[PDB]
Amino acid sequence: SEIDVEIVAVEREIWSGKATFVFTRTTSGEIGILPHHIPLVAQLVDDAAVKIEREGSDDLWWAIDGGFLSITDTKVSILAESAQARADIDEAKAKTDSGSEDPRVAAQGRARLRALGQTV
Template sequence: MAEMSVRLVAVEREVWSGQATFVFARTTIGEIGVLPHHVPLLAELTEAEVVRIDSTEEGEIFAAVHGGFLSVTESGVSILVESAELRDEIDVEQARVDLQSDDEDVRLMAKARLRAAGHEA
């Protein structure tokens, strides 16, 4: 099965990197699925969403991301975001509290965090 190099990088750290067979993300112009040997592209990600990476070693990786870009080149996929949390890093109870925030950005990110953690918002 074909593989590609994928990196998920937030402003403060590299969140995940490795080999994958598929990447799914939501961009400002629609959903995109990236397979190995995809044509090069640059897309802006929606503000608070979930990215899925099908890792060859770890299975499905889910991350809640905020803002950023997805870049596909011959060398692989780079997902560059303002912030990101992997499924096992998400504090589900805090995300549920954040759903009640007066700040719309906090509420949107809370919904993304809950979806990435496998919980309905």
């Protein structure tokens, strides 16, 4: 079995497919999801980072901007303001974004930084 993960944004969809293991961060801390659990609904943090693992393929590090995780019997949809790929993120832009004083900017930069390798 696998985990159906679909990263959708209020403006457009980013990714959609199956995974072997996925981890996300919400107001209740970080949590892991497997392809054999029960439904669930949690709200991701501002600088939340989702890690979608692929069976046989390298995981996908993406940054979510205030998104929400919704797990079902055999489906997992993630709705957020927007998403960003670790390969598209820039160590410079991430640092600056996190350096900003604004809440939105600080969130994006923090989320992108995490996907890059940063923590908290």
